[PDB]
Structure formats: C-alpha cells, structure tokens
Amino acid sequence: SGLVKMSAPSGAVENCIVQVTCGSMTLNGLWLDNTVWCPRHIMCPADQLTDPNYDALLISKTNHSFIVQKHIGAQANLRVVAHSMVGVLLKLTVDVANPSTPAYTFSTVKPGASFSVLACYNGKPTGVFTVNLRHNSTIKGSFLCGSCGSVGYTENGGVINFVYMHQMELSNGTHTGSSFDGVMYGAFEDKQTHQLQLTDKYCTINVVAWLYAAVLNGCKWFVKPTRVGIVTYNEWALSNQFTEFVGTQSIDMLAHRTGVSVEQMLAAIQSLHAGFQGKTILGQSTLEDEFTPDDVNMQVMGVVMQ
C-alpha cells in the first residue's frame, strides 16, 4: 500500500539523450534511430532570444553547423547528414542509427494526463519526476536554465511513449514544451515575451481517483450516503473551477472494488472543496488532482474475484 508520485524507469530514455551544439549554443537532444530532436532556439544566440525569426535563421544553417555528441554510456560521434524544422523543434538526420533505440511512438497528452520527465543538463540525465498537463496546458515542473530538450514520456506494454520536449519557463514553477510534432503545449511561442497563461482548474476525475485511493488505504470519513448526480456535479463545476466529470472504465473498476459510487465521490468533492473541516486525506488538507485513474490503479493493483 501507499500512494506516491511515481515515475516510469528512465533507463531506456537515458540511452537516447545527446548534446546538440550550434555555434555558442548547446542543448539536450533526443536520439532515436537516425534522428535527433532538439528545440529550434538552438539556432538563436545570446542576441535575439527575445523575439527572433527562425525562418531566416534556418536557411542560414548547414548540416555542418550542427554537431551532435553523446556523453554517456556508448560514446559518439554522429554526423548530421540532413536538417529540418518541425514547429518549434529542429529535426536532424544522422549517419548512425542509435543502437539503443527502444520500441516507441510519439503522442500528445491531453490536459489531466500525467507523464514522467527525465530532466537533463549538458546532455547528462540529472533527475526523474512526474508531472501532469494542467487544464491550461502547462506543467508544474522543476527546471533550470540549461534544461531545455529534457524529455517527458510514459511507458506501457513495452512501448515508450514520447510526449514532451521541454522548451521554457512561463512564470514561477510553470513550464511548457512541445510534443514531437513540434506543437507547443498551450500554443505558447518560443520567444521571450510576455505570454499569458489561462486560468487552470482542478481535474475532477483525478480527484475522484485520489479519493478512491484514500478509501483503499483506510481513509473513508468523507464518504456519506450523500450523492450528487453527474449532470448536477457538472453544472457546479463550471462555476467552481473544476473540469467536467466524464465516466471511464478505470474509475468504474475503483467504484466496484470499493463499493463506493461515483456520485458519492462527487458529493465528497463538493463538501471537501468547502473545507476539510480540520481533517486530512492521505496527509493532505487540500484536494490532490495529479494522480490519474490509471496511476491509482497501478499502485492499488489487485486480484479481482469474479
């Protein structure tokens, strides 16, 4: 038992981190098969990081103005034999295919989804932690200057899912980056201007998952015969900065395991948001909305009598 922010083992991602240099600039990159991915402001120097134009900066470059080095494990080497710009990423083709490429895919997480981040500095993996895409499509990470190109991922059934490359800090403890199609989460632009982030909401279905985790771990005082129907819950949510609740198989597995109905949980969320009345749920006195139903199921994984 217990519930902690848990990350996927970073081993398979570590073997793919490289360093990418362009002029005075050096960032982290991701080496998969014959391709190296890194943020495109690699081409921007000390000068124009404010409000540059990348289109001009790109044609200015050649397959040689990029050098790629691997500074961990099996060393490298690596010759850029082609280069392109995909959104806010730069896509490099290299002569050698990464021998340690894991089975993988690219996808884009939706708000409320969690993933693991391998934080990197100077091409060295430095830390692992879990975040989730907030309702305003930012993450609340821990990054410092030099950490761009750091890699967000999940792992499911042998497949590494690469979903995030770190780009920037929007404000205190608030970060964003892009998926590997080079779309920036939240549509922020990669220039150093004031860009405002939208409001952000508690993710209801994650709060519900959390409450089910509590119950399974012996905390159940917030559970009453009181119920709020989904449609009613959802009307209240639109005025109280909560996301709308939509049912899922994963939540229904938890309702079934605990014998506590979803609509009891939504009522609990209404009460608790008004105040924990000086009590605690798994140590917290505020609502935790960053464990997903899948995250909860993986840590309260059990045998089911059928």
Which positions are annotated as active-site residues? Answer: 41, 148
Q: Does 254 bind a second copy (CB under 8 A)?
A: no
Q: Should residue 7 be labelled a site residue for a second copy when binding is judged by CB under 8 A?
A: yes
Per rule CB under 8 A, is residue 272 in the interface with a second copy? no
Q: How far apart are CA 149 and CA 13, in angstroms?
A: 12
Q: Which residues of 99-113 are buried (b: 16+ CB within 10 A; e: fewer)?
A: eebbebeeeebebbb
Q: Is 144 in the site for a second copy (CB under 8 A)?
A: yes
157 counts as binding a second copy under rule CB under 8 A: no
- In sequence order, what are the residues at sequence separation of 6 or more whose Cβ sits closer than 8 angstroms to the Cβ of residue 144? 121
Nearest to residue 290, comparing CAs of 209, 174, 231, 223?
209
Interacting partner of 148 out of a second copy, Zn ion, none (Cβ under 5 to 8 A depending on kind): Zn ion
| In the complex, minimum distance from the CB of residue 182 to Zn ion, in angstroms, rounded to a whole number | 15
Q: Provide the minimum distance between the beta carbon of 230 and Zn ion in the complex, in angstroms, as a whole number.
A: 42
Would you count residue 141 as binding a second copy (CB under 8 A)? yes
Q: Do 104 and 98 touch, CB atoms closer than 8 A?
A: no
214 makes contact with a second copy (CB under 8 A): no
1 binds, among Zn ion, a second copy, none (CB under 5 to 8 A by kind): a second copy
Footprint on this chain of Zn ion (rule: CB under 5 A): 27, 148
Rounded distance, CA 109 to CA 60, Å? Answer: 33
Pairing outcome for strands 25-32 and 35-39? antiparallel
CA distance 229 to 208: 14
Name the residues that contact a second copy, by CB under 8 A.
1-12, 14-15, 116, 118-119, 125-129, 131, 140-144, 169, 172-175, 217-218, 280, 282-286, 298-301
